[PDB]
């Protein structure tokens, strides 16, 4: 089920320094987030919703932090970086609500 109930978002990434951008799909699961390529539409990475420490949504890009400075933050271009934060900020309330 590398794509069942998971909402994918077309976000663009900034390669090394290419003035260009690289499209990418981001799957948001109810308990995890995944990096899905827009080129192969395949899952490139998987993350736990309990790993995200914080985020910052702006009318241009979305940023998330796994709390692992070493890993570094992960930000990409998103015209709806807000919804991605509302959809995410929304799953975090549904997983913690059933944990009570």
């Amino acid at each position: 089920l590398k794509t069942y109930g998971v909402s994918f978002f077309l976000v663009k990434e900034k390669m090394k320094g290419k003035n260009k951008l690289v499209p990418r799909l981001l799957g948001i699961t109810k308990e995890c987030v995944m990096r899905v390529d827009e080129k192969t539409k395949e899952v490139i990475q998987e993350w736990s919703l309990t790993n995200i420490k914080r985020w910052a949504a702006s009318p241009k890009s979305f940023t998330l932090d796994f709390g692992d400075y070493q890993d570094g933050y992960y930000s990409v271009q998103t015209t709806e970086g807000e919804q991605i934060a509302q959809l995410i900020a929304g799953y975090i309330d549904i997983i913690l609500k059933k944990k009570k």
């Binding site: 919703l49 309990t50 995200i52 420490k53 914080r54 985020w55 949504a57 309330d93």
Partner: peptide, 8 residues
């Protein structure tokens, strides 16, 4: 400002 999550 930033924003956090209840996940303590």
């Amino acid at each position: 400002s930033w924003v956090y999550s209840p996940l303590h």
